[PDB]
Each structure stands twice: as structure tokens, then as C-alpha cells.
């Protein structure tokens, strides 16, 4: 039901060991499907359903767009660096935009930019305006509210974005609607009289998962500690959840895993 198209981009004065300074990437339903960077200079496919359904003119046009935006943000880094009266150092421009078709069937679109990791300027589609988060964004707002660029952005986020999302979702219907069952391992360690149970779910897809601990049949809302959902290197996901207990109550805990690839929730023990 839910489908998402999202493009994000980062320009940095200090990209770090091994890194290009400009990188923009796209995701469909959470899945990285296209990539561009300032070293390769070319927008390239990243899945097999986008490559199988795209010509070269698509990729050359995406590359031209990405080069235009690469120097747009090259200029923007210097512009903001001395707009803040800064004489070098570590600075970052980030942008993220896209559209969502939600589970009730309505559409939403968004676009927002950050300087140095904090909200810089956001798009209020409805007002066709640009809300400034900092004084230094009152300038950019004006530059972005002249001409019809705002209306073009609205029309992109409401029409172009959503139909390209629909087409991408059709291209990869088999791959994105796939389901991978996680394997759950329950482990245990005793430290200083406290027994700590770990529950690890390896290699599940899609990303939405609900892992809970249960003590004598009841979910331990406030006692579980989790590392969140972390990615595997292959399009699958991982998560671990720990809980503390007294040794001797160790066999009353059950790890319950709720995931789309399970018709019934998985119950696992130590």
C-alpha cells in the first residue's frame, strides 16, 4: 500500500577518507535504486529492475541533472560559508525531497535543506512558500520565491514525482514486494548477577519489523533495549533487542517477532 520516492544529496567541504565531496542517491520504498557522485560524474543504476527498464537517454539526462545540481551545491557551499562569515573548515549542505503514496491512498510531497546538520529551509507546498528556519535562510527564500520555481517544485512533487514513483513500483513489483524470513537467535550472558537475554533477527525484508520480549506471557514495554533496525550489505535488515532479568527467570522470556514474512508471530526461547 505505502510507496515512497525520495532523493537525498550531500555536499561537504570535508568528505573524509575515501569519499567524494558530492553524493546524491535515490530510494524507492526504502531501496537504494540510483546513485551519483562527484568522482564518477555519471548517474548509475543500483538495482536490476531499474536497469532492465531504463534506456541510456534516461541515465544521460539524470547525469546532466546531477551535474547541474553538483555545481549548484558547489556554489552553495561557498555562498553559505561566508554568509555565516566562516573562513574554511568542516561544512555540509544536505537536501532531501520526494513524495509518498500512503496507505489511505492520498499523496504527500516534501522538500527541505539543511546547513551544517540543522534545518535551513523547507518547502510549504500548500502556501507555495519557503519557510526559513534560520535568519540566514530569509535570503535564500527570496531567491527561491522569485519567478515560478516554487510552482514548478509543487508540480514536480505532486505530479512528476508521484507518477515516476508509480512507474518505478511497477518496474520492481516482484523485487520490492518480496519477503525474506529473518532467522532469530536467542543468546544469553550472565555478568554481575544479572542475566541479559539478546534476541537477534538476521536478514529480513521489508524493513518494518516489531521485536518484543515477553515475560511470563506479557510484553515488556519498558524493559527492552534495542539497537534499532540496521542494514545488511545485501538489501536485508538486522535488529537486536536485549533485556535484563534475574538468573532463574531466564526461561520465562520469549522473543516475539512480527514481520510481513510471517503469517503468525514467531516465538523463540533461550
Amino acid at each position: 500500500e505505502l510507496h515512497t520516492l525520495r532523493y537525498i544529496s550531500t555536499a561537504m567541504t570535508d568528505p573524509g577518507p575515501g569519499q567524494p565531496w558530492y553524493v546524491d542517491v535515490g530510494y524507492v520504498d526504502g531501496e537504494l535504486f540510483t546513485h551519483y557522485n562527484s568522482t564518477a560524474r555519471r548517474a548509475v543504476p543500483r538495482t536490476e529492475w531499474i536497469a532492465a527498464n531504463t534506456d541510456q537517454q534516461y541515465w544521460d539526462s539524470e547525469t546532466q541533472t546531477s551535474q547541474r545540481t553538483e555545481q549548484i551545491d558547489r556554489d552553495g557551499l561557498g555562498t553559505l560559508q561566508r554568509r555565516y562569515n566562516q573562513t574554511g573548515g568542516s561544512h555540509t549542505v544536505q537536501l532531501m525531497y520526494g513524495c509518498d503514496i500512503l496507505e489511505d491512498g492520498t499523496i504527500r510531497g516534501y522538500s527541505q535543506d539543511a546547513y551544517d546538520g540543522r534545518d535551513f529551509i523547507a518547502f510549504d507546498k500548500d502556501t507555495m512558500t519557503f519557510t526559513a528556519a534560520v535568519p540566514e535562510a530569509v535570503p535564500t527564500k527570496r531567491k527561491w520565491e522569485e519567478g515560478d520555481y516554487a510552482e514548478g517544485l509543487k508540480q514536480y512533487l505532486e505530479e512528476t514525482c508521484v507518477e515516476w514513483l508509480r512507474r518505478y513500483v511497477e518496474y520492481g513489483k516482484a523485487e520490492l514486494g518480496r519477503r525474506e524470513r529473518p532467522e532469530v537467535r536467542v543468546w544469553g550472558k550472565e555478568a554481575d548477577g544479572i542475566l541479559t537475554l539478546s534476541c537477534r533477527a538476521h536478514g529480513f525484508y521489508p524493513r518494518p519489523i516489531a521485536v518484543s520480549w515477553l515475560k511470563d506471557g506479557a510484553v515488556q514495554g519498558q524493559d527492552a533495549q534495542s539497537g534499532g533496525i540496521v542494514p545488511n550489505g545485501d538489501g536485508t535488515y538486522h535488529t537486536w533487542v536485549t533485556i535484563d532479568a534475574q538468573p532463574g527467570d531466564g526461561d520465562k522470556y520469549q522473543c516475539r517477532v512480527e514481520h510481513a514474512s510471517l503469517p503468525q508471530p514467531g516465538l523463540y526461547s533461550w
Binding site: 532523493y7 546524491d24 535515490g26 548517474a43 534516461y58 539526462s61 539524470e62 541533472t65 546531477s66 547541474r68 545540481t69 549548484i72 551545491d73 556554489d75 552553495g76 555562498t79 553559505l80 549542505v93 537536501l95 525531497y97 535564500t140 531567491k143 527561491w144 520555481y149 514548478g152 517544485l153 514536480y156 512528476t160 514525482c161 515516476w164
Partner: peptide, 8 residues
């Protein structure tokens, strides 16, 4: 498809 941007 990516969208076009403007200068900061």
C-alpha cells in the same frame, strides 16, 4: 527522476 534546482 531527479528534479532541477536553483542556486543558494
Amino acid at each position: 527522476r531527479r528534479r532541477e534546482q536553483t542556486d543558494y
